């Protein structure tokens, strides 16, 4: 034991979210872009906005599925292009992922979906 191997490197997904602020009856919004990291080693997730500012990040930890499945955590199999994930009540829309991630998914039998556009 003790062999050096980096076979559990993070998977990265590009996602966006719309900050929709309801003003009386009119809703204004802006688009925020994030990078979602999934760590195979411990199934933890981290989110960061590449761009007192609120909502720019989510620390690395295991994230529960949204109701009614909060007794379970998100796994690597819940992430794909054209799929939505919900962290702390906010909906993230995954639209891409790098080559390394696409290759990793293929190696574990996952078919990566076509572009959302």
Q: How many domains does the chain have?
A: 1
| Distance, CA of 50 to CA of 27 (rounded, Å) | 25
> What is the CATH number for 40?
2.30.29.170
Q: Is the separation of the CB atoms in 82 and 116 below 8 Å?
A: yes
Q: Is residue 16 within 8 Å of 32, Cβ to Cβ? A: yes
Do residues 42 and 57 touch, judged by C-beta distance below 8 A? no
Find the largest Cα–Cα distance for the chain: 62
> d(Cα 13, Cα 85) in Å, to the nearest integer?
11
Q: How was this structure determined?
A: X-ray
Structural domain including 111 reads: 1-117
């Amino acid at each position: 034991s003790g062999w050096v191997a980096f076979d559990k490197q993070v998977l990265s997904f590009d996602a966006y979210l719309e900050e929709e602020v309801l003003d009386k009856s009119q809703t204004n919004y802006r688009i925020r872009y994030y990078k979602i990291y999934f760590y195979p080693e411990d199934d933890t997730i981290q989110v960061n906005e590449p761009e007192l500012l609120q909502g720019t990040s989510i620390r690395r930890h295991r994230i529960t599925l949204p109701p009614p499945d909060e007794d379970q955590f998100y796994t690597v199999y819940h992430f794909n292009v054209g799929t939505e994930v919900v962290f702390y009540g906010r909906t993230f829309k995954i639209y891409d992922c790098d080559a390394f991630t696409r290759n990793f998914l293929r190696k574990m039998g996952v078919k990566v979906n076509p572009p959302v556009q």
